[PDB]
Amino acid sequence: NGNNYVYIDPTQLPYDHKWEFPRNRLSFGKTLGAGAFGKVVEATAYGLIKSDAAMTVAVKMLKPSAHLTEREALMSELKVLSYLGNHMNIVNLLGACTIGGPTLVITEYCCYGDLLNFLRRKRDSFLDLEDLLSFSYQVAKGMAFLASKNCIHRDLAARNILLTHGRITKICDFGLARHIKNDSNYVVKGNARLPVKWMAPESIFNCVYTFESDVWSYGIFLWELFSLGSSPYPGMPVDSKFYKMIKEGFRMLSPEHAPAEMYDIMKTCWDADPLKRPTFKQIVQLIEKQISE
Amino acid sequence: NNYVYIDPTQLPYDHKWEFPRNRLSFGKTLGAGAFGKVVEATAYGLIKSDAAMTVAVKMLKPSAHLTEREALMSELKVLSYLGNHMNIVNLLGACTIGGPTLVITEYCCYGDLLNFLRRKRDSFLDLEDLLSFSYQVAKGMAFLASKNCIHRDLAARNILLTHGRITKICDFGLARHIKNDSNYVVKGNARLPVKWMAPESIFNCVYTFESDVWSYGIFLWELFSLGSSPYPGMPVDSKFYKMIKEGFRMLSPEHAPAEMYDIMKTCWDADPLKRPTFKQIVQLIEKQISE
Amino acid sequence: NGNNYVYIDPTQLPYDHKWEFPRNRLSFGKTLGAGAFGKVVEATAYGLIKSDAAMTVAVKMLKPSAHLTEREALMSELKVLSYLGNHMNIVNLLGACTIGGPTLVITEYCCYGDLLNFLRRKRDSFLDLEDLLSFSYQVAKGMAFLASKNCIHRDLAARNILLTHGRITKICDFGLARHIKNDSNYVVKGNARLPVKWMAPESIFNCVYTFESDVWSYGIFLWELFSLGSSPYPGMPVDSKFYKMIKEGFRMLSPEHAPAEMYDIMKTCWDADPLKRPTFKQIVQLIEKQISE
Amino acid sequence: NNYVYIDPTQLPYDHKWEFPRNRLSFGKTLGAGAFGKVVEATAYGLIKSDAAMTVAVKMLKPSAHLTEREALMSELKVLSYLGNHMNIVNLLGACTIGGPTLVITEYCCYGDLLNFLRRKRDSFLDLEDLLSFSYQVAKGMAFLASKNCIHRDLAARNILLTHGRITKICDFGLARHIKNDSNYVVKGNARLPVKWMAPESIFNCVYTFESDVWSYGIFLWELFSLGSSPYPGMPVDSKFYKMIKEGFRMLSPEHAPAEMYDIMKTCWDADPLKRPTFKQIVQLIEKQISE
């Protein structure tokens, strides 16, 4: 009754059927990633674009291990993706299958896989510095787009950036298609397993996920990136001591390969006051103005 | 679920809005409900540091529960999220530290539009002004829609009038009592404005963007009626609901141009996806303008 | 050769034919305004919008008194109008007739005529203050639109604002359809007859027409408006003394009916430094923030 | 004619761009023409007040006429009008008072793209990078088009390379001599880059938005050729022009993916209105990306 202005979230809202696509026009292939309850699969879609009779795509789907909770999560993801719109630097929705079977969410296939692996298998023969400047600019633009659509990414990290042609990087939601009890980057806090080393303190202590929370993670991502795929706070486990250190204001030092301008952005992203952190729009404009330096 | 849309009521309070409450004076109550009220006030140095202006302040009565404190704070965070527009009542500032929460918004000197239409029903202000009211309220809703917001009580009684012939959509939440207003009627758990609500909202309790358009149609009807009451004479009971489901509708207001009536009708399509969107309603009007 | 970045003006560019409309579907009626070389005519257009079989429109056309120079001016106007786009607060292009006869430019008809006349025939029974606030806001929005499309109006003045339904005002180009040797508001300077009392000094002395030049005229328009249709610098002829006065920095005083906020805008519009003048976007935002005062 | 579009070269010089020339040092010449040059330079306190950066400064030689002073000042006012974008060389500041006009823009450390392609023609940098170059240059042109600007000399030789794998469209006006470059050839009054010009530009001297797209096609051809010369072997004479009118075209570069070739072909449509716009070319590529 009170407060007549109610924000409507695209999750709670009709599924637009312009996305629906015949499940008899998909051929599933090798799995690309799986969690306990879901998986992303490589596939061929026939007649998805009138120019490409057969294009490789990725399909997100649940495993028969999955309950009602998961089935709704996948539909929410589909709905969310359906409202975002397209941008070069995210993985885009191509279509879905809801009628006549389990829900299938069809998105872009990114042939070069994810950025962390790429960075690590390349740590030796060091792809060079300019590619790394390019990736951080592109990820910034992609976060700026998500933020202009009022959207937050609650797991920004090199392991969720994918690589495709034209040297393009794309931000990705891996939800459900990743097993986190097996990954030490995810650690128990409260009920959940979270990526706390990528998380802003206000997110860890006060459970607040703002737009500036993402900017912190972007900072950890830059460190991740210029370290060529190393872990954040390398060697140190997440525990009482860590939380205390983050709270007191201790920060990581510059990676050996970060130019001075980037570490500079890193540091401001990690300001304890969220309000002193740059926005993604500012990061993008900063990288563009300083590109010749 | 990595991707998540931010809810405005979850964001932290932005201190850019903070305003010293020793710069406020209170005057007469504009509206009161069970748990809160809206008071006329003076704020010094609010826009210009030189100057003083009249504003409206919304606040809780001493008998407010945590649910009402949350409602008032949510009202504030939504307003802050929306930003400014000429056709809503805007947030001007808040007092949060040093006492009860105060939400400062625009004062609208001419009062609400329903009362204005009734007191003007005698002389007939002309049809050109009712056109402007239509256009402005649609512009205001198109704007709320664009920020992904819905209004739960769009009705001439929640539309305010200010200078420059400007009309503003307003959230009267918490500052109206309804237990004695025939327009609000018990259904299920709550008291609701049923004559203004779309059928799918009454039944399945679906509040969406197309629900508002329905209410816009009922508004257009109030408007070109000069503030007569909707579905006049009919009480709300089983008879009423059953009839609305079976396609029952109001006929054209005596003073509506046929086109505006056609928009009303399209607003009342039983099928939510056949109703116009506000953006479309704006664009219609912006051509029904030269003809 | 030098300078490879060349701005292309919509005047010099192909006429898009999506505007072309059959001249056998127009019936000309009474003239609304004429110059020596052209005129605007009231007309009926059959089948212009599928909803209105017969709507009144305005048609701009040359008189047989007109030379090649004028014929090109009218086509330039048509081209300009064709690129602007629509906005509620200007008079919009509806179509043209180029093939099989003289050029005809079809625009919106505004039933209540122009604002200056309206203001003057209403000076006695004083339509009230709130309508005047509304007109200045609407004209500001219309200038803001023109400026966002990089367009300037070189004759902004109450005599070029038209009135239509819904209490809507619309900015208008009267070019060619007005005789200026008969109107004392237009006065000789150099070769041309110009509206110098509406013109910014940098426009008068240095022949520079910027976006802030328009803002000056907007200021004179507000004065014109809150004086209920009086002439600017009433009684004083344009001559050496006037130019000197404008140059030294003398300004008009507030009209008897201008609220303090408006005269305030007036004054800043008339700053001798163009750079200290508000932009139309700022004027609009100022009027909106202060609307409750 | 009351409505008039502002030409950027007519606007007054904006002093927000002014920069003290005692904060500049000059180094080596990057490029020189008959009447002017572009020099490598250091500017202190240009972006950060703390710091120094390398920039490029464009200026007139002592033998420049009023037409060249105007060209240089027009270059400056156009750049100021366009504003920033990642894919053009941007204006950083100007020195106008206290001596000759100096136009400060971005230094691009890797030099021009034509030379880069040739020196890389040996090893084969891969096809993924040529895709990025295509996309970036189209993004840059789409941007110039959106500000209603045309480029009179779009060619790999006027595309510069900087950090982050970024390519930037550049105006080399005044800082190249052409009297000895076979790529510029006398036609009528001027020396022109004819192999890059659309047919309607050579004849009726029509320079429009669709003329640029033609040149973009020739660029795509240079690009996937690794900087071979266009219409290789053929000199420009009556033979040449007559053939271009009668539909003569280049065939696919040995290393072009078929789709990119299809865009080249559509860029070379004799009918200006059949050619894609840059906005369309961007959007194509942004899907030819996952396949």
From Swiss-Prot, chains A, C:
- Tell me the outcome of changing I8A: Reduction in SH2B2/APS binding. Abolishes SH2B2/APS binding
Keywords noted in UniProt: ATP-binding, Cell membrane, Cytoplasm, Disease variant, Disulfide bond, Glycoprotein, Immunoglobulin domain, Kinase, Magnesium, Membrane, Metal-binding, Nucleotide-binding, Phosphoprotein, Proto-oncogene, Receptor, Repeat, Signal, Transferase, Transmembrane, Transmembrane helix, Tyrosine-protein kinase, Ubl conjugation
Which positions are annotated as binding Mg(2+)?
A: Y5, N160, D173
Region listing for Important for interaction with phosphotyrosine-binding proteins, in residue ranges: 5-7
Supply the induction statement: Up-regulated by cis-retinoic acid in neuroblastoma cell lines.
One term of GO molecular function: stem cell factor receptor activity
* Protein task: Tyrosine-protein kinase that acts as a cell-surface receptor for the cytokine KITLG/SCF and plays an essential role in the regulation of cell survival and proliferation, hematopoiesis, stem cell maintenance, gametogenesis, mast cell development, migration and function, and in melanogenesis. In response to KITLG/SCF binding, KIT can activate several signaling pathways. Phosphorylates PIK3R1, PLCG1, SH2B2/APS and CBL. Activates the AKT1 signaling pathway by phosphorylation of PIK3R1, the regulatory subunit of phosphatidylinositol 3-kinase.
User: Any extra remark in the record?
Assistant: Numerous proteins are phosphorylated in response to KIT signaling, but it is not evident to determine which are directly phosphorylated by KIT under in vivo conditions.
Record's disease association: Piebald trait: Autosomal dominant genetic developmental abnormality of pigmentation characterized by congenital patches of white skin and hair that lack melanocytes. Gastrointestinal stromal tumor: Common mesenchymal neoplasms arising in the gastrointestinal tract, most often in the stomach. They are histologically, immunohistochemically, and genetically different from typical leiomyomas, leiomyosarcomas, and schwannomas. Most GISTs are composed of a fairly uniform population of spindle-shaped cells. Some tumors are dominated by epithelioid cells or contain a mixture of spindle and epithelioid morphologies. Primary GISTs in the gastrointestinal tract commonly metastasize in the omentum and mesenteries, often as multiple nodules.
Describe its assembly: Monomer in the absence of bound KITLG/SCF. Homodimer in the presence of bound KITLG/SCF, forming a heterotetramer with two KITLG/SCF molecules. Interacts (via phosphorylated tyrosine residues) with the adapter proteins GRB2 and GRB7 (via SH2 domain), and SH2B2/APS. Interacts (via C-terminus) with MPDZ (via the tenth PDZ domain). Interacts (via phosphorylated tyrosine residues) with PIK3R1 and PIK3 catalytic subunit. Interacts (via phosphorylated tyrosine) with CRK (isoform Crk-II), FYN, SHC1 and MATK/CHK (via SH2 domain). Interacts with LYN and FES/FPS.
Indicate what this protein is called per its UniProt record.
Answer: Mast/stem cell growth factor receptor Kit
Origin organism of this chain? Homo sapiens (Human)
First and last residue shown, out of the full length, are 564 to 930 of 976
